[model samples]
Target chain A: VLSPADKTNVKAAWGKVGAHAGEYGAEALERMFLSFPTTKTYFPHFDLSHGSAQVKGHGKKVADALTNAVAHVDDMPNALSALSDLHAHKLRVDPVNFKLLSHCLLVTLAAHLPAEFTPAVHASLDKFLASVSTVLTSKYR
Target chain B: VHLTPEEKSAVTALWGKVNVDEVGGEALGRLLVVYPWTQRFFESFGDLSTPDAVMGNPKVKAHGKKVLGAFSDGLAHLDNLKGTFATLSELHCDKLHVDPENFRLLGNVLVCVLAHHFGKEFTPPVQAAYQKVVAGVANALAHKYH
Candidate 1:
């Protein structure tokens, strides 16, 4: 269960993470978009220079939402039900679009934090993003 | 645990029967169904005629290699249902985020592709393993969304 203090810590950690967003995150996202060309159209109008900032802000929003959800981790079904309503019904953002966002975030991390990054980090992040995005996209449904 | 002689032989035999190029047909078809735009993306790759031109795009080649490697690993893992299913289930439950229903759907497609490629011998265990995995995935999804 995440406490208020835990949320504060996470927010601080994210600040550090965001500081490197332009370097690691941006590069990774650019490459991911290149690799998944079909998803590129989603960001056609995005300005690459400021794109990292926009992505960073979006990432923070998601992080905050997820962190809040952690408090209810013991009752994941109830949590997901609420999330489904928010994402599927309210936000109306297609799950596939989350894939686009994921690619961008990964690219940014890889580029900026090359020294701290390792295969384990990549695998963990891959799994994390895949799992989260799968929910976001609701690919199964 | 290390593979016993029979297990090793079984794996060797399976590897011997595999043709990487031929595997793409069914695998790509399944991928297309799950990821609708995958076909278009693959077609675009196909349109790149020259080896030099194809190699020129580093990102494309890199991603292609990664996907191919994953496919190879997935294929090898197919023969051992207990081990494969366990690992895949963990990956789904701990790693992936799709809800139960979606995970079930994805698992069905995955099982269908594997069974199709590996033959009827793989059917019963694959179905059983998938059912178990899908349950965990559903639980994870429910937990995540709630």
Candidate 2:
């Protein structure tokens, strides 16, 4: 349901974010775990300390999933269905944590892309992340 | 920072008729459907593509009730709105990092729902009173960001 303007804004914004997307993801996760301590409960298997190798690797994975969403915005439900299944069944995440991560991601984006994250771009990116979130959490029921 | 006795009464009168589930779900569903991008905040929701789908989802309906419940709380504590919403402000601003823009959007959606349901009864002066209420609520929810 993204408007043409929204799609254009999201792609253009991603162009700026892509180069350092992984770095931003790391920062986002860092913000999430620190600001929302409960979120760290999900990642007990990994080091929750600042700047851990595991966090960095997981950050990269987050960026890759985001990249995949960017590439398949039109068909997100199918594109991320497997990841959703994994999260819903295997990971068994609380689902609410997704919003926590999404929130941190926006903070990261706003901090880094102060100029690029205009109101329009912010709205577009928010929508994109929402679609990604919905698809990822679709199987939770 | 204040609602006149008349303003408060106007808002309370309209609020009493609200079906929290129907209006709240409509407001939430409309925000996602109309804005499209606002859906990013609810990563846990199911299919949000269509109006029917967004409205039909149990999670959406449940969340809609929660959203309105928050509004109802705000309505109940019009004077102590900042205190009432303080914890929520922390959750939204610090934890969830919700955009304040979305707050205004939601308030407007609530306005739309009221107007649609109440029709001519939602008069200009009444809508103005409600806007003040929404503005106060929005400000309180955003207080933690500062």
Candidate 3:
């Protein structure tokens, strides 16, 4: 339900959330790894222990990718096409893992931006993240 | 739904002290009583028109035991929950078509059951970690729906 109002709110919220989006992303990953450790299997090459630099850097990539998708909100499938191929074809990460990370991302946002996390914003963000997750996993055919 | 190492230990250690049969029965029975619509799923289990009747039902007791047994399995495989619950996810989502909301409902009831029995030992930190555990289990079981 990415209505115009939803898209507008999402962009406004993200705009206000300027800077350190990577740090927020890192916490989201940390939450996923800590809450659902099975997700760590996807990152065998990276150290998954607490406070790892690799996680922080990877979080930055994750945030950057999300930022790109935000700019292409109306066409996430096209925007994330290459990353989708990489994940579905090469990484082969279970599609369910994306949901776990998205859940963590919502938790991270709520925890850090309680004032900005109005019900409408929360719903909008959930739709945005879910749409992104769907596109990321769409190529798992 | 994050659990640090200490939080994880808090969960497992508390779980180590749980009386599976007692808490499971209580939690499931409470769910039936408090959320009677849920009884529709258990119609085959026979009469549950009353709270006392629900608590006294032997089939309910047996099913609750199995439910908590699943929880124990979840605790053992926190790292591989989706795989661990894959079969259950299929049954609940694909075949049963259960409302996923019931999963969280039962989870909260299970926590209340723990709180009732564990008393002061069910400290804030342990409760926090257990919430994460409950959420992970619920999500894993509900994965097939999405």
Candidate 4:
């Protein structure tokens, strides 16, 4: 659902964040949980406070998963659906919480990929993430 | 969870000493006795009723290692992989009715088997690393069940 030029820009921006995968993902995830503390309840065991290993680890995982999904936008919902089976059925995740992660991840992409995150890139990614949100919540609905 | 650099080497080396022939068999043996419900899947236990017999049986021993061997196959990827042991997860959570708690229980005693094997060398770092690894694996299995 992105213009051709916008899609290319978003993909390129995504690549920049992914290039520094470990750092970007974990950092963004930490922000997500901290800013949206209510979401932290689902991760009862994780010490989501800043700098905790669990925070960093789980955060990084989220980032990496997002990076992969965003990078392969051409094959969207199909790529992202794999996560729902685990998150919805077994983990019993509240579907709305993923929105928090999606938001923070975009911030991370913006902050880290500064020069590359033009308005077009952000707009395209916004649309792309909307689809991702749809896929993540599809199981719940 | 990211292991400290010191923890990484210690863990890799510690698990390296684990002889599957012993670790796998002994752990399964302990699991069967502590959690009777798990034994339901092991019908081979028809005649081999005791935990001792289950451990001694060739078929059980072979499969025991195979069960844990998936874990062994994953040690190298501990730093990167998430939601591992998928095949085992499907088999236990989907095929068999193994409870999530039993996996945690198996992980706890499986350490003793390692502790026994490592003896004095199963120091705090190694113990901690092993515990974390098992927890990660157990958590992965529990993910599909709860």
B1-146: candidate 3 lDDT, tens digit per residue = 34678877888898998998877887788778656688999999997976668888999999999999999999988788788899999999999998898897688567656655665465445666887888889999999987
TM-score of chain B of each: 0.36, 0.95, 0.96, 0.88
Q: CA lDDT of each candidate?
A: 0.48, 0.83, 0.78, 0.66
Better of 1 and 4 by lDDT: 4
Candidate 4 residues B35-56, lDDT tens each? 4567777786554575456667
lDDT of 1 by residue, B1-146 (tens): 23445544454454455555444344334444454333333444553333344434444444444433444454354444334345444654455432234544544564565567778756564455444443443343344333
**lDDT score at residue A129, model 2, on the 0-100 scale:** 79
Interface root mean square deviation per prediction: 9.2, 8.4, 10.8, 22.9
Tens-digit lDDT track of model 3 for A49-129: 777898898888998898898899988878899998988778876867886787667666655665665545655776788
Q: Give the TM-score of candidate 3.
A: 0.57
Per-prediction DockQ comes to 0.03, 0.06, 0.02, 0.01
Q: Candidate order by TM-score, highest to lowest?
A: 3, 2, 4, 1
* Regions more than 4 Å wrong, model 1: A1-60, A63-83, A90-97, A139-141, B1-146
Error of model 1, residue A58, in angstroms: 3.7
Off by over 4 Å in 3: B1-98, B101-133, B136-146
Q: In TM-score terms, which candidate is top?
A: 3
Per-residue accuracy of model 2 over B1-146 as CA lDDT, tens digit each: 69999999999998998888788888888887766556656767877766788878888888888989999999999999899889989998888776677788889998999999999999998999999988998999999877
For residue B88, give model 2's deviation from the true position in Å. Answer: 0.7
Worst 10 residues of 3 chain B by lDDT: B116-125
Candidate 3 chain A: 10-residue stretch with minimal lDDT = A114-123
Q: lDDT tens string, model 2, A1-141? A: 688888888887777876687798888899999998877756778988889889987898898888888888887778888898777544645546788898888889899889988988889888877778777766533
Q: Clash pairs of candidate 4?
A: none
lDDT tens digits by residue: candidate 4, A1-141: 655765686667776665577676776566556444577677777676557787667766776777777677787667777786777667767656765565455555655554664434554665676667766666743
